[PDB]
Amino acid sequence: HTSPDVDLGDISGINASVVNIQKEIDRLNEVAKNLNESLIDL
Amino acid sequence: HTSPDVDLGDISGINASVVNIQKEIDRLNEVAKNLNESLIDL
Amino acid sequence: HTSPDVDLGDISGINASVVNIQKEIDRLNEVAKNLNESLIDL
Amino acid sequence: ENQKLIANQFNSAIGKIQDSLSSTASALGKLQDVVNQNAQALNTLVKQLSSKFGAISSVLNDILSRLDKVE
Amino acid sequence: ENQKLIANQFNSAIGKIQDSLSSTASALGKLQDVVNQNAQALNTLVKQLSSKFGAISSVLNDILSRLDKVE
Amino acid sequence: ENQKLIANQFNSAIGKIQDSLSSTASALGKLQDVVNQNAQALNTLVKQLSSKFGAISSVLNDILSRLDKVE
């Protein structure tokens, strides 16, 4: 008898990262707004 | 005796969203095609 | 008696794809570098 | 003369920006396809996992019940 | 005259590129939101799965132990 | 004079668009890295889950078999 403790374990080392491109989106919107200071007014 | 019904349950509240940026891709392609109407022909 | 082999099975047909937009990122950086050959020098 | 220069370099820049916008559109399309596919994959995984754990629970209660019958 | 032409078509091009950059910003924002949401979903799935398999293991050892008690 | 104006503002616009394209390239690169990493994570999760459910099934059949031996 004396069956061993059958431990299945754990899903270790599995984890998803996270995008942080807020700086780039802010830069894109800032450039889209600043391009109004590049229009030609003869 | 009379072991209780050991219900493990369900993975509730877990669900992945879906990107719908088809409008933005269509706008990008439309602009890439409409920029031909902005070329300078002296 | 003779309980049947209760096989749970396997999570078949589940698999995640992989983005390969390295060509497009390389094109974007190449254009960002080649736009220096489009600056006007009167 | 400088007008031909401004026009030609503006046309070059607009062509390069057209190429860049087409590349960005293709990249966003591929990213959308893959993100939606991985989302559908995660969803079908959670569904099939719900079913699998349901079956596991079921055979578990069968085990406990027939054990209680033994005891 | 050609100066009005160059200016007007440059302003048209800059407006179209402003629209394209705003569209790219919106698309990247939506993609970021959805990728982060699916990442949080996968993380909570792995956590809840760890807990669920813990419970499964626990009832399993209870089963084996009381079986050994039977035997 | 207006030629210096057109040239200078075109150069400003091209610099800003260069910055925007570099930002879009960096954003798409980060998004690609994270989407591929989450894809690899989901794949290794489905693999490790297949193995874990295999082990669970195995101990389950051992349980049922030695139970039938008891009965």
Numbering used by the authors:
A (entry chain D), B (entry chain F), C (entry chain E): 1159 to 1200
D (entry chain C), E (entry chain A), F (entry chain B): 918 to 988
List sentences from the manuscript.
Vaccines and therapeutics targeting the critical viral spike glycoprotein (S) must accommodate the mutations in S. Even the highly conserved region that plays a critical role in membrane fusion exhibits up to three mutations in the HR1 region of Omicron variants. To reduce the public health threat of Omicron and future emerging variants, we and others have proposed development of antivirals targeting the relatively conserved heptad repeat 1 and 2 (HR1 and HR2) regions of the spike glycoprotein (S) that drive membrane fusion by the formation of the HR1HR2 postfusion bundle. Although the ~130 residues of the HR1 and HR2 regions are conserved in all prior SARS-CoV-2 variants, a few mutations have reached fixation with Omicron in the HR1 region (Q954H and N969K for all Omicron subvariants, and, additionally, L981F for BA.1).
The long sidechain of K969 is closely packed with F970 of a neighboring HR1 strand, which limits the possible rotamers of the K969 sidechain. The N969K mutant structure revealed a similar HR2 backbone displacement as observed in the Omicron HR1HR2 structure with all three mutations —the average Cα atom rmsd for residues 1,162 to 1,170 is 0.7 Å between the N969K structure and the Omicron structure, 2.3 Å between the N969K structure and the Wuhan structure, and 2.4 Å between the Omicron variant structure and the Wuhan strain structure. This suggests that N969K alone is the major cause for the conformational change of HR2 in the postfusion bundle structure of Omicron. The comparison with the Omicron and Wuhan postfusion bundle structures illustrates structural rearrangement of HR2 to accommodate the long lysine sidechain at position 969. Thus, the N969K mutation results in a major deflection of the HR2 backbone away from its Wuhan variant position to avoid steric clashes. First, we identified the Omicron N969K mutation as the primary cause of the structural change in the Omicron HR1HR2 postfusion bundle, the sidechain of which displaces the HR2 backbone in its N-terminal extended region. Upon the inspection of the N696K mutant structure, we predicted that the insertion of an additional residue in HR2 near the Omicron HR1 K969 residue might better accommodate the K969 mutation, thus promoting a more stable interface between HR1 and HR2.
